[model samples]
Target: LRGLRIIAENKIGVLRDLTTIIANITFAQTFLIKHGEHEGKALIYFEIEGGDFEKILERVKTFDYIIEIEEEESFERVFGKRVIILGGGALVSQVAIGAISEADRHNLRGERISVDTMPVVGEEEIAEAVKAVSRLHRAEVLVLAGGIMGGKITEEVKKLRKSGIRVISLSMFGSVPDVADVVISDPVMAGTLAVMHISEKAKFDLDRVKGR
Candidate 1:
C-alpha cells in the first residue's frame, strides 16, 4: 500500500504539470485522471485535444523512464486521392471512420490516406499531422480540423500556412475563434458533415454520413 501511495502522489504531480500545460494553451478543459500500468509501474492516461496531442507526446517521449511511446496512423487511399483526419476522439474518430466508409462507397481513388490522433492543445502534434496530410494529399484541405482553441487555433493555422497547407473548413464542439475558415455547429457532426461536403464536391459519393 505504501508503494501505491507513492505512485499515486507522483501521478498527481504529473497531472499538475499537465493541467498547467493545458491552462497555458488556454484549453477550457483538461482530461480526467486514468489509472493503469506502464512497465509494472502505476501509470495514468490523460485524453487531450488532437491539436496539442503531438507536443505533449514528444515531451513525454523525452523522459527516459517512460516505457514506450506508440504512434499509430490509419489511412485509406484510392490511386491519387487522399484525406488526412487529424483528431481522434470518441466523437471525432466516429466521424472519420464514417467518412472513410463513405469514400469507399463512392469509389474515391487515392493512396497514402492517413488519420492520426494528436493531443488536445498540443501544437506540435497538429503541425506534424498537417505536414503529413499535405504531403499525402498534395493539397491544403488537411488543415480543416482546427478550432479546439479560439485564437490558439489561429496560431496553428499560421503554422500550417508556413507549412504550405491552406485552412479549409474549421469545425468544433463549441464556438471557436472567428479565425476559422468555416465554423460548424457541433464538432463531431461538423466533421462528418464536412467530409460529406468535401467528398461530394470532389465528385465522390459517401456510403455513410452519420458519425459512428
Candidate 2:
C-alpha cells in the first residue's frame, strides 16, 4: 500500500480549509483525507510531489496545525483490475497461465462478458524476445509478473509506457525501472486480473486483460 492516511480534527472549518488545500494538490491518484478525534494536529499522508508534499504539509501547519511526518509508505493495488500478461519466466509462468485459467473458469465479462488472460513474459530475457519478434505489441495494457526487469528490458518497457501503454507489475517497481503505471500491491490473482483487463478488449467466444 505504500500509502499514507491524512487525519484531521472533526471540526468543520479546519476540515474545509484542509479540503481546499487538498483540492489543488496533485497526485497520481486521489489523496484520501480523513477526520479523527485528535486535535492541534492533523495527518495527511502523501509523498509524491507535483503539489510538493512537504511544502503543502508546511502550509497546512501554517494554518495552526503542526505537521508531523510519518516515515513508512505503501503502494497502489488494482484488483478486479484488467491487463495484458506481458512478462514472466519458466518457473513463474504458471502464475500467468494459471491466471488465464482462473479468468476462464469464472466466465466473467462482455455482453455480461467474462474476462480472460493474455499475458507475455520471459525467464527475464523474454522482454527482449518479445520486442525482437516485432509482431507482438498488440496490447495496450501490460501486466508484468515473476521477472527481474532491469537493463534493456526495463528501458524498453519504459518506452512502451511512454507510448500510452499502461504497465502493471507484481513487484513494486523495486527491481525494474519505475516505469510501470501500476503494481499489484501484493500475483496470479493479480495475473487473473490482468487477464480480465485484456479480455475486455478482445471481443470473443475466445478473448483477454491488464493496464487499468
Candidate 3:
C-alpha cells in the first residue's frame, strides 16, 4: 500500500527447456504462478528486455524435445472479470480483511461480476464452490487465488489447470498443501500477501493492458 499502484497485466508465452527452466534467475521474478504451453508457444516473462529465449531454445533442442514453451492469459486482460476466493478454513482475525482484499481486488464491492466466495464449512460445500469454478472455465474466466478451501479446492484446479483456469490446495492445520497454487502457512500472512500481490500486480504485472 505504500508505493504500489494499480495497473494491468497480461499472460506471456515462450519456448524453453523444461529441465533447465528453474536455473534462470529472471524466472524467479514474477510471483504469479503461470500456466503450461498451448501448441508450441508458452508464457514467457512479463516483457523481458529481449534476450536469451532463442538461446534457451537452441540449448534445449538437444534434450530430445521440440520447441515448446508456456502459459499466459492474464486476469487484467479480462475487464468484466469474476474472481473466486475459495477459503482455506484458516481461523484468523484478518478473515474479513482477506475477504475484503479479494473483494477489492476483483472490484466486487461495486457492480462487477461479483467475485464469489465459498466459505470454510468443510468439503461438503466443495460441490457448490467447485461448481462455480467449473462454470468459470466454461465461460472462459480465470483465477487469482490465495489458497484452496480444502482438497476439494484442488480438484477443481487440477481439472481446470489443463484448460489454464485456476489454482490448487492451500496448507494450514494440515489441509492439502500439495494441491495449492498459492499456499500460505498462516492465514493472516496469506491475507496480507494477497493484498500485497494485488498491489504488486497492479504495478509489475506486464501481462495485462494498461489504461483500458
Candidate 4:
C-alpha cells in the first residue's frame, strides 16, 4: 500500500507537470485519471473534489482526454454578458489570442468589452481582474483558464459573485472539480467562444462563429 501510494504520488506529480506545461496553464490540484485494473475501466482522482464533476467532464472531453465515467451533464452555456478571460502562460496566451480575434470579428469593442491575462496564478490575481472588468464594463461573465482551478481561483469567483460579478470558468487540463458559472472548453477554445458569445449578447454584428 505504501509503495502504491508513493508511486501514485510520483505519477501524479509527473502528470501534473506534463499537463500544466503542455496546456500552458496552472492548477491548484494536479489530478490523475488512470485506468483501473480492468482493461476498459478508469478512475479519476483529484487532490480535491468540490462537486463540480459536470464541468470537469466537459473539459476532459473537450481536450479529447478519455473518461471512463459516464457522461454526467451538458456543458454550461453563456449566451450574453460582459466577459473576463483569466490566466497566463502559453495556453492562456493562445486562448487570449483566439478570444481577441473572435471579439473583433463580432465588433465588440469601445465599451461592454474586455479581456485580461494574469501573470501568475492566485485568488487575488483573479479577483483583481474581475474587479477591473466590473468597474470598467459591469462584467457579468467570467471565463477562467483551467489553470485557475484549485488554489484560490474557485474561492475568488465565489467572492466576486458575492460582490455582484457574474462569473464563469473554462478549463484546459480538465474540468475544475469546483463549481463555476460555466465550463466551455479547453483554455484556447474557451477564450474564443467566450468572446464570441459575449459579443453576440451585446448585439454586435458578426460574420459567423469560428470553430476549431
Candidate 5:
C-alpha cells in the first residue's frame, strides 16, 4: 500500500478537498488535534493502490492550507500485525515477555508482529476492551491472561473470534478455556503460541491444536 501523510489546517471541507482529487483510494483516515502545538490542525492519511499516485501527490502539495506532506510505507507494512495481551498485572507481564521475545525472532525474518499489553481487571472493563480489539487496526491475535475470566469476558471473546481475530486463553479458573481456540496452561507458551499463530514465516498451525 502506498501512503501519503498530510498535515494541514483544520478547516471545513478539508477531507472533501483531498478525497475528491483522487480515484480508487484504498483507505483514508483523518485525525484532528484539539490540544498541543499542532492544535486546530489535521493529520490526514490516504492509501492508494492504483492510478497516478505521483500526480496526486504533486497536486495535493499545491493546496494553500497544507502544512507538510510526505510519502511513507503503510502502517500495515511498518508496524505489521498486532498481538494484544490483557488481564492481571502478573500474567500480563509474563505473557508480554514471551510474546515480545518470540516476535523478535520472527521480525528478524521479515515478519512484522507488534505486541501490546494492558493489565486490566473487572469483567465489564475487560469485556469492553476485548470487544474493542476487533476494531483495532491489524489486531490479529488476542491472549486473555488472568487468574480467572469468564462470564461477559468469555462471551466477548466468542464474538471477537467470530469476527476472525484468533483468541488464546490461559488455563485458569473459568469457562474461557472451553471456548478459546487453544488453552495453554503455561502463560509463556500461550504468549509464544499467540505470536506463532500470526507469523507467516512460522510453521505452527492453530488448527492442529484446536481442542487442546
Candidate 6:
C-alpha cells in the first residue's frame, strides 16, 4: 500500500479535486481528519495501490490548496487494528490494563494495535454502541467487560459477529457470554485475548480456543 498525507485548506472542493485525480486507482481510501492539531486546516491521508502513487502525488502537488504533501505510512499500518472495551468503569479499566500491556509488547515488535475504552450503562445505549462498532474503521474486536450484559445487547452482538467483528464477553450473569465468540471470567485476560486474536504477531489464535 502507498500513503500520502496532505495538509490543505479546509474547504469542500479540496476532496473533490483530489478524488477526481485518483479516480482510476484500483483501491484507494481517503481520510479527512477534523480534530486535534489540524483542527481548522484540512489534514487528509490517502492510501492507494503502490503502482501509480507517484503520478497521483505529482498531480495533487499541482493544486494550490495543498499546503503540504508527502508520502507516508497508511493509517492501517500506523494504527493497525483496534480493541474496544465497554462496560462498568472498574471492569473497563481492568480490561484496558491487559489490553494496553499486551498491545505494548506486540507494538514493540512492529505491531500497531490500539485500545479504546468507554464506561457505559443502560441496555439500549450499550446495544447501540455495540452496533456502532461495525461502522468504525479498524475496529477488529469488542470486549464486554461488565457484571451482566444480554438481551438487546446480545442481539446486537449477533449482528456484530455477522459483520465479521469478533466479540469477547466476560463470564457474568447474562446471555451475552453464550452468544460471544469466547467467554472468560478474567477481565485482564479478556483484554489480552482481544489484542492477541487481532494482532498479526500474537500466536494465540481464536480458532484454537473455539468451544472450551
Judged by lDDT, which candidate is best? 5
lDDT of 6 at 11: 81
- Candidate with better lDDT, 4 vs 6: 6
lDDT for 14 in candidate 4 is: 46
Per-residue lDDT tens digits of candidate 3, residues 1-212? 01111111232322323325433332222233255433323323432223464564455445433333333333333333444555543343344355455546545333233334445445656545555676552222222233334465446546665654434233543344554445555554444443333342334221342343
Q: What 10-residue stretch in candidate 3 is worst by lDDT? A: 1-10
Please provide, for model 4 over 155-180, each residue's C-alpha lDDT reduced to its tens digit, 9 standing for 90 to 100.
55666666565444654343342456
> Which candidate number maximizes TM-score?
5
lDDT of 5 by residue, 1-212 (tens): 69898899989887898888885677788999788878889999998888888998888888999998988898878888999998999998899989999999998888699998899999999999999999988999999999899999989988987889998889888888888888888989889989998999888979876444
What order do candidates take by TM-score, descending? 5, 6, 4, 1, 2, 3
lDDT agreement of model 2 with the native: 0.48
Candidate 2: TM-score? 0.39
TM-score per candidate:
0.40, 0.39, 0.38, 0.44, 0.95, 0.88
Model 5 scores a C-alpha lDDT of: 0.89
Candidate 3 regions with alpha-carbon error over 4 angstroms:
1-79, 88-96, 99-115, 137-153, 168-170, 173-175, 192-212
Q: What is the C-alpha RMSD of each candidate to the true structure, in Å?
A: 15.0, 16.8, 15.4, 18.7, 1.4, 2.4
Deviation of model 3 at 101, angstroms: 4.2
- Looking at model 6, report the run of 10 residues with the lowest lDDT sum: 23-32
**Better candidate number, 2 or 5, judged by lDDT:** 5
Q: After superposition, how far is residue 1 of candidate 2 from its true place, in Å?
A: 44
Across 28-142, the per-residue lDDT of candidate 6 in tens digits comes to: 4545556876667877777777457788889988888888899888667788889999989999999999999999999989879999888998889999999999988889999
**Cα lDDT for residue 133, candidate 3:** 70
